[PDB]
Amino acid sequence: KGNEFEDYCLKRELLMGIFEMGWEKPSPIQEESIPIALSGRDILARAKNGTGKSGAYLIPLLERLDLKKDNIQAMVIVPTRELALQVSQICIQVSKHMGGAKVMATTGGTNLRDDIMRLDDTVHVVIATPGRILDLIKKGVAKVDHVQMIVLDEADKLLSQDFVQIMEDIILTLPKNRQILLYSATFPLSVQKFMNSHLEKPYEIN
Ligand SMILES: [Zn+2]
């Protein structure tokens, strides 16, 4: 076994959401990564650009949430507002039966003012573009002292010269031992460096 969703120790309410996406059986990326991410181990995974592997990290991300705590517990970083919305919609659909999971997308698109206000209400999962979330963190609006997991989706684009420093600053505000799941089409030096610096005994997937 190990190629079926119910073989991964997932909440029944979460399984319902998964299947309602049309995901009957786990893809190879979800099969290899879900059990490992669930165990808490850092991951570096090769995957094509797009929302293809969204489920691979959204499922363990959602499974780990404790909806009894109203603090932001997970973060997903993406390079564009477009991907942020696609991933957020999927996340909202998959967690629809979990009983109150709150997702929030915040990027250069949505005006800052409204997002500040929105962060006054409970938010469990923040999906965002580099600059916007760093801004919200520095302003003290996005409290991330409970972030237990952070995902870098398209790490090569997020670690380009224009964002690398912003990513570095983000990581610095999170709890020291936060779980890091990294997904990227390519593994340039910039990704290798960031990985050596912050990931702990990461499980790799080519
Ligand atoms: Zn339903």
Spacing, Cα 206 to ligand 1 middle (Å): 34
**Residue 189 class from Cβ within 10 Å (0-12 exposed, 13-18 middle, 19+ buried)?**
exposed
Angstrom distance (rounded) from CA 88 to CA 42: 22
- Say what the resolution is, in angstroms: 2.0
How many structural domains compose the chain?
A: 1
Angstrom distance (rounded) from CA 104 to CA 205: 29
Spacing, Cα 88 to ligand 1 middle (Å): 17
**52 is an annotated ligand-binding site residue:** yes
Spacing, Cα 98 to ligand 1 middle (Å): 10
- SS3 (DSSP) at 22: coil
**In the block, which residue shows the tokens 């963190």?**
137
Q: Which amino acid is at 102?
A: K
Give the distance from CA 47 to its chain's centroid: 15
Spacing, Cα 93 to ligand 1 middle (Å): 9
Q: What is the DSSP string of 49-72?
A: SSSTTHHHHHHHHHHH--TTS-S-
R_g (Cα) of the chain, nearest Å: 16
Could you say which DSSP state residue 176 is in?
T
Could you say which DSSP state residue 202 is in?
P
Backbone angles phi, psi at 120, to 5 degrees: -85, -25
Helix 12-19 vs helix 81-94: crossing angle, to nearest 10: 120
Spacing, Cα 97 to ligand 1 middle (Å): 6
Backbone angles phi, psi at 60, to 5 degrees: -70, -30
Angstrom distance (rounded) from CA 61 to CA 128: 15
Residue 187 in tokens: 């593994």
126 DSSP β-pair partners: 75, 104
Spacing, Cα 169 to ligand 1 middle (Å): 39
* Alpha helix (H) residue ranges in the chain: 12-19, 28-38, 54-64, 81-94, 112-118, 130-138, 155-158, 164-173, 189-198
**1 is an annotated ligand-binding site residue:** no
Decide the pairing of beta strands 125-128 and 43-46: unpaired
Residue 61 in tokens: 């991300």
Q: 154 with 49: CB under 8 angstroms?
A: yes
Spacing, Cα 15 to ligand 1 middle (Å): 10
For residue 15, the tally of other CB atoms under 10 A from its CB is 18
Q: What's 96's domain CATH number?
A: 3.40.50.300
Could you say which DSSP state residue 145 is in?
T
Q: 47 with 183: CB under 8 angstroms?
A: yes
- At residue 41's C-alpha, the angle toward residues 36 and 45, to 5°, is 70
**In the block, which residue shows the tokens 């603090």?**
71
Q: 62 with 116: CB under 8 angstroms?
A: no
**Residue 36 class from Cβ within 10 Å (0-12 exposed, 13-18 middle, 19+ buried)?**
middle
Spacing, Cα 14 to ligand 1 middle (Å): 10
**40 is an annotated ligand-binding site residue:** no
**48 is an annotated ligand-binding site residue:** yes
Domain that includes residue 110, residue range:
1-206
Angstrom distance (rounded) from CA 44 to CA 126: 21
**Residue 128 class from Cβ within 10 Å (0-12 exposed, 13-18 middle, 19+ buried)?**
buried
**139 is an annotated ligand-binding site residue:** no
Angstrom distance (rounded) from CA 194 to CA 42: 13
Angstrom distance (rounded) from CA 83 to CA 86: 5
Q: 21 with 183: CB under 8 angstroms?
A: no
Spacing, Cα 69 to ligand 1 middle (Å): 24
182 DSSP β-pair partners: 44, 152
Residue 97 in tokens: 């039966």
Beta strands in 59-163 (DSSP E): 74-77, 103-106, 125-128, 149-153
For residue 185, the tally of other CB atoms under 10 A from its CB is 13
